[PDB]
Each structure stands twice: as C-alpha cells, then as structure tokens.
Design an enzyme around this catalytic site. Structure first.
Site, PDB file in Angstrom:
ATOM      1  N   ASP A   1       1.217  -4.564   8.997  1.00 14.19           N
ATOM      2  CA  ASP A   1       0.090  -3.613   8.534  1.00 14.19           C
ATOM      3  C   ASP A   1      -0.991  -4.657   8.468  1.00 14.19           C
ATOM      4  O   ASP A   1      -1.213  -5.561   7.530  1.00 14.19           O
ATOM      5  CB  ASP A   1       0.468  -2.901   7.499  1.00 14.19           C
ATOM      6  CG  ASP A   1      -0.673  -1.586   7.318  1.00 14.19           C
ATOM      7  OD1 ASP A   1      -1.992  -2.005   7.628  1.00 14.19           O
ATOM      8  OD2 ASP A   1      -0.729  -0.681   6.781  1.00 14.19           O
TER       9      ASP A   1
ATOM     10  N   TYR B   1     -11.628   1.575   9.617  1.00 16.58           N
ATOM     11  CA  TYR B   1     -12.744   1.962   9.020  1.00 16.58           C
ATOM     12  C   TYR B   1     -12.972   1.009   7.818  1.00 16.58           C
ATOM     13  O   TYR B   1     -13.877   1.276   6.735  1.00 16.58           O
ATOM     14  CB  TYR B   1     -12.453   3.400   8.342  1.00 16.58           C
ATOM     15  CG  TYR B   1     -11.208   3.639   7.574  1.00 16.58           C
ATOM     16  CD1 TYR B   1     -11.305   3.159   6.303  1.00 16.58           C
ATOM     17  CD2 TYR B   1     -10.229   4.374   7.902  1.00 16.58           C
ATOM     18  CE1 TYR B   1     -10.157   3.571   5.520  1.00 16.58           C
ATOM     19  CE2 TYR B   1      -9.090   4.676   7.105  1.00 16.58           C
ATOM     20  CZ  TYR B   1      -9.137   4.229   5.779  1.00 16.58           C
ATOM     21  OH  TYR B   1      -8.083   4.415   5.113  1.00 16.58           O
ATOM     22  N   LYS B   2     -12.284   0.063   7.522  1.00 12.15           N
ATOM     23  CA  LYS B   2     -12.532  -0.983   6.681  1.00 12.15           C
ATOM     24  C   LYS B   2     -13.419  -2.169   7.194  1.00 12.15           C
ATOM     25  O   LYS B   2     -14.699  -1.812   7.282  1.00 12.15           O
ATOM     26  CB  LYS B   2     -11.194  -1.473   5.934  1.00 12.15           C
ATOM     27  CG  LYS B   2     -10.540  -0.505   5.522  1.00 12.15           C
ATOM     28  CD  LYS B   2      -8.941  -0.685   4.781  1.00 12.15           C
ATOM     29  CE  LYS B   2      -8.637   0.272   3.926  1.00 12.15           C
ATOM     30  NZ  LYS B   2      -7.003   0.477   3.947  1.00 12.15           N
TER      31      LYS B   2
ATOM     32  N   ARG C   1     -11.473  -5.115  -8.330  1.00 16.62           N
ATOM     33  CA  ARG C   1     -11.260  -5.416  -6.760  1.00 16.62           C
ATOM     34  C   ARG C   1     -12.649  -5.544  -6.143  1.00 16.62           C
ATOM     35  O   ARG C   1     -13.477  -4.599  -5.968  1.00 16.62           O
ATOM     36  CB  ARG C   1     -10.271  -4.791  -5.793  1.00 16.62           C
ATOM     37  CG  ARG C   1     -10.280  -5.426  -4.641  1.00 16.62           C
ATOM     38  CD  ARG C   1      -8.988  -4.671  -3.706  1.00 16.62           C
ATOM     39  NE  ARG C   1      -9.439  -3.031  -3.406  1.00 16.62           N
ATOM     40  CZ  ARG C   1      -9.096  -2.665  -2.454  1.00 16.62           C
ATOM     41  NH1 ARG C   1      -8.101  -2.716  -1.484  1.00 16.62           N
ATOM     42  NH2 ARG C   1      -9.528  -1.424  -2.130  1.00 16.62           N
TER      43      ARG C   1
ATOM     44  N   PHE D   1       0.853  -1.447   0.141  1.00 12.33           N
ATOM     45  CA  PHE D   1      -0.001   0.047  -0.083  1.00 12.33           C
ATOM     46  C   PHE D   1       0.687   1.290   0.155  1.00 12.33           C
ATOM     47  O   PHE D   1       1.775   1.312   0.715  1.00 12.33           O
ATOM     48  CB  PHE D   1      -0.969  -0.020   1.241  1.00 12.33           C
ATOM     49  CG  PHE D   1      -1.867   1.046   1.022  1.00 12.33           C
ATOM     50  CD1 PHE D   1      -3.261   0.746   0.657  1.00 12.33           C
ATOM     51  CD2 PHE D   1      -1.779   2.285   1.761  1.00 12.33           C
ATOM     52  CE1 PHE D   1      -4.197   1.412   0.441  1.00 12.33           C
ATOM     53  CE2 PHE D   1      -3.012   3.252   1.796  1.00 12.33           C
ATOM     54  CZ  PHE D   1      -4.002   2.813   1.077  1.00 12.33           C
TER      55      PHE D   1
HETATM   56  C1  LIG Z   1      -6.452   1.556   4.239  1.00 12.34           C
HETATM   57  C2  LIG Z   1      -4.912   1.403   4.423  1.00 12.34           C
HETATM   58  C3  LIG Z   1      -3.873   2.300   5.015  1.00 12.34           C
HETATM   59  C4  LIG Z   1      -4.801   3.678   5.511  1.00 12.34           C
HETATM   60  O1  LIG Z   1      -3.756   4.435   5.941  1.00 12.34           O
HETATM   61  P1  LIG Z   1      -4.211   6.060   6.730  1.00 12.34           P
HETATM   62  O2  LIG Z   1      -2.981   6.453   7.180  1.00 12.34           O
HETATM   63  O3  LIG Z   1      -5.235   5.363   7.479  1.00 12.34           O
HETATM   64  O4  LIG Z   1      -5.005   6.528   5.446  1.00 12.34           O
HETATM   65  C5  LIG Z   1      -2.614   2.261   5.205  1.00 12.34           C
HETATM   66  N1  LIG Z   1      -2.102   0.971   5.048  1.00 12.34           N
HETATM   67  C6  LIG Z   1      -2.706   0.024   4.235  1.00 12.34           C
HETATM   68  C7  LIG Z   1      -2.042  -1.266   4.036  1.00 12.34           C
HETATM   69  C8  LIG Z   1      -3.969   0.027   4.079  1.00 12.34           C
HETATM   70  O5  LIG Z   1      -4.431  -1.130   3.773  1.00 12.34           O
HETATM   71 CL   LIG Z   2      -7.589  -0.416   0.347  1.00 11.56          CL
END
Ligand SMILES: *Cc1c(COP(=O)(O)O)cnc(C)c1O
Ligand SMILES: [Cl-]
Ligand SMILES: *Cc1c(COP(=O)(O)O)cnc(C)c1O
Ligand SMILES: [Cl-]
Lengths: 404, 404
Positions: free
Chosen positions: B200, B225-226, B374, B128
């Site tokens: 993560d 939030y997911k 996705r 990510f």
């Molecule tokens: C959703 C997601 C984030 C989100 O990062 P924020 O700092 O909360 O915007 C970060 N890393 C991964 C791997 C994600 O899936």
């Molecule tokens: Cl995502």
C-alpha cells in the site's frame, strides 16, 4: 396524431417548468437520458463550491465544515423517497457492480446458515452484462458449487426458481427490451420458494414507481447517473431491508462502514444499519452533484412522472408506426404498460447505421446488440413536440436511405 | 537555525515556482497534505469543462468525444512515471480499500494453485485500519483457514514471515509513525519465503522514491488524494506485475474490465493486462481532476522532491527541539532518513488539544490515537519559512497553555 396535437400536449403539461432546471444543448433531441442523464443547471455551481471553497479553502477541515462525512447517508435519505425506502436505509457509494457484489455476498452468507445446499443464483440471459459478470466473479472466487442459471425469457423464471435457489437476482427493467418485471409478484414467488430477491433498479429508480417495502424486497442496488441525473459516473446506491442488514457483515468492509460509536482498533466492527455498506473514501466532487439531480424530483412525484413517461412512449410508438410503417421496424418493447419501463426499442436490419444517422442529426438514442435501436424518454426534460420532430427526422432518414 | 536562515532556504529553493500552481487559502500553514492534498489551480477549470461541456453539451457522446473511455488508463500511465511502472500497468479506479480487495484476492488465488496450505497473511498491528478491515472481510468470506498475523513492530516482521505465509501485506510508510520500510529488502525476503508481496503506497506515491519493478513487488495500491493532490476522495490506483496479472482474474469482474476486442456476451472475458482490474463506471468529474495533480509532478522529479522533503522534516524536528524543548514532546518518527517518509509525528499527553489549538491558529496537522500529533510536509507547495512560523505558533501555544 399531428404536430399541433403535440404542441397542445406541451401547453397542457404541468411538468413543463421542470425542463428549465436543466441545461440542454441547442438543437439536440436527447433520447439517451436512460444511459447518461442530462445536466441540472445547479450542478456547475455546486461543483464550483466543492472545488474552490470546500477543497481549496477548507481543505481537510471540510470533512466537518462542509458536511462530507455524512454525504453518502444524506443523499441516500433523499433517494429513499423515490423507491419506498425510509431514512437510514440507503447509502450512495461506489458503483452498481461493486454494490451488487456487496449485497450478493451478504445474501449468500445469510442463506449459508438459513438453508445450506442452496447453491443456485437465478437470473436472465439478457441481464445487463456487468450484473452477470459480477455474479460470475463472486461464485468463481467462493467455490462451491455456486452456479448461475441463465433464463432466456421472463415467462421461464417461475420454473427456474425452486428449492435449489439461494438468490433470484434480476434487473427490474430490462436494459435492452424495456420489459418491466412485477417486483412484488416475483419477490413473493422467490420467498415462497425460499430464495432471497435482489433487484437492480438501474432502469427503475427515477423512471417508474418503486416501493421496496411494499414489494418485500431483500436487497436492491442502482445507478444515479441515468434517470437520477447525478452526472457522469456518479456513484451508485444500495438499499438493504432492515430485516436482513445487521444479520451478517458484507465483505467489502472498509473503514467508512466501521461503527462511529467506537474507536478504530485492529478489529473491524460494523455500523448498525446501512452504513455498514459504506467502504472507502468517496469521490466527493462527483458525489455532491448527485444532490442536484435528486432535488428536481422533490418538485414532483413518481406517479406524475410515470404518467408523462407513458404518454411519451405511447406517442413515440404511435408516431413511428404512423410515419415509418413502410420501413422494416420491429417493436421489441411491450405494448402493455404494466410490462413497460420508460424507454422504447425497435429492431432494424441496419439498426446501428440508423442510430448513427440519427446521432448525426442531433437525435440521440443508442444501439444495443443485436440490431436494437433504443430511445429513452425522460419526462423531467423531454417535450411531446420533440418526440414528433425526432420521428420526422427518422422518417426522412429511412425514406432517403441516409443511413447508407 | 533562525527565521532568516529559512528565508534564505526559500530563496535558494529551485522548486519555489511550483507553489504558484496551487491555490492555497491565505493565512493557513497547511501541514495535512498527506491526508488531503491542496488544490492545483487548474482543477477548477478542468471540472468546469467536464461539467459544462463534456456532460452538459456532449452528453453520452463524450464517452468518445471527451476521452472518458480510456481516462483510467491514461491517468494510470501518467502516475506510473512516479512509481517505477511502465505504460499499460497502472489504472486509476475505485478506492484503496476496493483495490486492495482486488489484488489480495488475486494473490491468494495465485497461491492456492502454486502453494496450497499457505493460509497466513502477515501485516502490522499499526497498519491503516481499512487495510486490516479489508483483509479481515475477505478472509471471513472465503473460509479457510485464512487468518491474519498482526506484528507489533517492523523488526518482528522477518520471524513472522515463513513457509505458512501466502501474502505479506504492508503499508510502505506507516500512517502514524512515518516509518518507511525497505521495499526491496522485505519483498526479496517475502519471495525467499514463498510469499507474494502487496504494498500500500498511500503515504509513498508522490512522497518518496518508489520503483516497483526494481523492488520486485507483486501487487501495489495507493491513493491519489493525498500527496498526488487529485481532489477530495479522488480515485485510487492499482498496479500489478506483468508476471502475475494475466494468471488469474480478480473477483470484482465488472464490465469495464471485459476485453475490448470481443462483444459483451453472457460470459465474462477479462482484458489482457491491467485493464482487467477495472470494474464499473467511474465518477468522471472527480477522476478528471486527478490529472491536474499529476501534471505538477511532470515539472520536476521524485529525487528533487525527496531532497526538499527531507530538508523540511529535518528543519521541523530541529526547530521543535530548538523552540519547544521545555515541553513534553516525544519524537515518534525515525531520525534515520532511510526509515523516514515525508511526515513527522510527536506524542504529547494533551496531543489532541494541542492539534486543535494549532488548527485554531491556521496551522493544520492532524491527531492520531493515541496522543500523536502528525504533520505532513509537501515540498511542492510548503516553504521553509512557513515551517519556522508554524513552530513559533506551536511554541506560543505550549508556553501559554492555550490548548487548555
Ligand atoms: C489514505 C489511506 C487509505 C484510504 O482508503 P480508501 O479506501 O481510499 O478510503 C487506505 N490505506 C492506507 C494505508 C491509507 O494511508
Ligand atoms: Cl492518513
Ligand atoms: C447502468 C447499469 C449498470 C452500471 O454498472 P456500473 O458498475 O455503475 O458501471 C449496472 N447494471 C445495470 C442493470 C445497468 O442498467
Ligand atoms: Cl444502459
């Protein structure tokens, strides 16, 4: 001064209608809007729409269809009107502690190229603790010989600012005493000495006149949950002078600060301008309510609010002396208006106990160590008469030794 | 498989009652709860109470009288039940980007004493973007010779992890492919090589079984939030192994992480335990709603959810092949369950266009570059029949070339 004089002041108060835009609890005289701002009526319906409509129905689509993608910047643009900033210079994101870390890091990195060997960050001993703690954390992680010079009074600042000073980091209005620095003069002096100037506006933005451009300020940060009435823990803001913003990246380089003109490849590329101080996904429900607080300010201006604020603190100090002289109160806030923010602090041997007895009667200030009783005056929704009534309750408590 | 087979699966689904605890919009088949979780019914009333009662009436008093002072820790304690953590080990605060900065800083400082000369942070090219960007920002600020080794596939990880590796930083489930790492095995291998392991959990917590203690993990971070359904931009979490937590401070040392047993003097003193990863005042309205998402999980367990999740992704893959074989779809998510998370990704030459045509018909997944479509499967509120209906719409679009 009499109660009838206060009733007349309220009758003559052109800001009186703005009080109706807040939902205040009955029977409370709230003198802590410098710590948590009271609630705008509109915040409830705004949140209900974010939750029920934007989240609940729109779901992920709302990043576009509810404006969430540019909320930090639109809110920053609104807030800018209150602090002498322009469009595209302020974002509302994260917290004051975090934003301070971002700008202090940026400032030290600018000074590492400009003037290496400069290693001192000057500030005050009575600075809000988190500002000290964040500066201490950053210096401790970097190494070295970055160190912090704590100065014990405002008058000692000039001698502590010299050729060794990378950064002067000050809270513009002292959270304890209510003492207000001359931003323009201490900034000019910081620049004269080669230092950059970072200003924490937590007790300034929405409370006193601020003009960051006129002052020549380099970086600034502050809160929206105090005088700006954004809601509990509502997100902080950050401003960076256009002169400095694009010179270096800030270290909390999250994806929301990535340039919007290019794809998100493995290598971070910062946005031009303030958007590079964005980091991660912001709590949207809390963020959206910042707007409701900012909206009230649009109906007046900081000159008018400053005028009513000084009238309220003048009245509080006068009434306390008038009614409570025969007790052991010591004014710690400056009498001189140019050195005064929008709150008033008195010391008292049993200050904690008196503050709680006041809270027990619905008069809400707060206690700061040591022995300080602090009262915030918020001209958007504070009346002159309620100042009178508050002092009368304080007088009753002190006379009867209710605090015991 | 037929539609009637899917109707029967729903009839036999013991998790079916939990769907009623979410307020879903009519006509939508929501396959993006891996990016923004759908809304628990209770979130609206919870926020209304925070706003109208806690803020509006309680005001500053609510730091005590509404529980705000320990909300990050109580929420962390709840979340801990889903990731093999114990009480006093998790806090919900800030964002995933910020929390990653905190733990990566802590990890490198631990390794600077333990094993200096270790200067490499190993990760994946398809990580990510914000995780990469945060690691890049930190390394860039520290100096040096801290560098990032981007590995192009999961099988290349073992050869990239060696004596030079300070830290292995991985997202447990790949945000694009849906590939799932073996946490225990890659952690054991990181430790064998002398590296610390940071995971993560953004696409893991609330989606697949996680046991941080069993895995021997050192630090972890993730989103609420997911799959945890906390609301838009709801605060992230952070976990630190009790073995490591008190060894060093983390650099974002704000006042909420100061020890609660002593006064706030000029010198920062960290709390014992996870509370030292707290920083500043958290957006309370958004934070409080995290509880509503966590509460639904309490009515089942991750084994049961994993079971339904695999049944849903198995069904999606099968139905897509059954119905859409005559079109140019390429499965990118692993067929093998032990390497599969809770989403499914297909590549398609006009993937962006197909995703938007699906969104135009109320079937909401998302588009990832390049050419990836996705779809997230959220067993708390996704039915088998709606998977069938979604595929039928996809088939109609592909047959008619509606995407054009
Ligand atoms: C959703 C997601 C984030 C989100 O990062 P924020 O700092 O909360 O915007 C970060 N890393 C991964 C791997 C994600 O899936
Ligand atoms: Cl995502
Ligand atoms: C209110 C206040 C803060 C608050 O910091 P958070 O990180 O938002 O908790 C920081 N600094 C000053 C000077 C304050 O007045
Ligand atoms: Cl304060």
């Amino acid at each position: 001064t009499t109660r009838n004089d206060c009733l007349a002041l309220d009758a003559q108060d052109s800001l009186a209608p703005l009080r109706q835009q807040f939902a205040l609890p009955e029977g409370v005289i709230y003198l802590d809007g410098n710590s948590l701002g009271a609630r705008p009526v509109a915040a409830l319906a705004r949140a209900q729409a974010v939750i029920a409509e934007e989240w609940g129905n729109g779901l992920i689509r709302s990043w576009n269809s509810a404006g969430w993608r540019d909320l930090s910047e639109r809110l920053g643009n609104r807030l800018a009107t209150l602090i002498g900033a322009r469009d595209g210079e302020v974002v509302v994101t994260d917290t004051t502690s975090i934003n301070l870390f971002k700008v202090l890091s940026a400032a030290l990195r600018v000074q590492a190229t400009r003037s290496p060997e400069r290693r001192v960050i000057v500030t005050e001993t009575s600075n809000f603790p988190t500002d000290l703690y964040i500066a201490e954390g950053l210096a401790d992680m970097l190494q070295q010989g970055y160190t912090l010079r704590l100065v014990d009074s405002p008058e000692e600042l000039p001698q502590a600012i010299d050729q060794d000073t990378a950064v002067v980091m000050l809270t513009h209005v002292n959270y304890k005493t209510g003492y207000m620095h001359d931003m323009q003069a201490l900034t000019a002096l910081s620049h004269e000495c080669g230092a950059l100037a970072i200003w924490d506006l937590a007790h300034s933005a929405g409370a006193v006149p601020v003009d960051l451009h006129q002052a020549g300020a380099d970086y600034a940060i502050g809160c929206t949950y105090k005088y700006l009435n954004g809601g509990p823990g509502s997100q902080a803001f950050v401003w960076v002078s256009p002169q400095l913003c694009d010179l270096v990246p800030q270290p909390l380089s999250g994806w929301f600060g990535h340039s919007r003109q290019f794809a998100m490849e493995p290598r971070y590329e910062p946005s031009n301008g303030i958007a590079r101080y964005l980091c991660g996904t912001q709590p949207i429900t809390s963020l959206a309510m910042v707007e409701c607080g900012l909206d009230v300010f649009a109906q007046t201006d900081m000159a008018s609010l400053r005028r009513k604020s000084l009238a309220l603190t003048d009245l509080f100090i006068e009434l306390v002396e008038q009614r409570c002289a025969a007790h052991e109160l010591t004014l710690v806030t400056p009498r001189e208006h140019a050195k005064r923010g929008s709150h008033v602090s008195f010391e008292h041997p049993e200050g904690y106990a008196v503050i709680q007895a006041l809270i027990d009667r619905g008069v809400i200030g707060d206690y700061r160590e040591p022995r300080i009783m602090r009262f915030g005056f918020t001209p958007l929704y504070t009346t002159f008469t309620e100042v009178w009534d508050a002092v009368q309750i304080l007088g009753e408590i002190l006379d009867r030794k209710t605090w015991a």
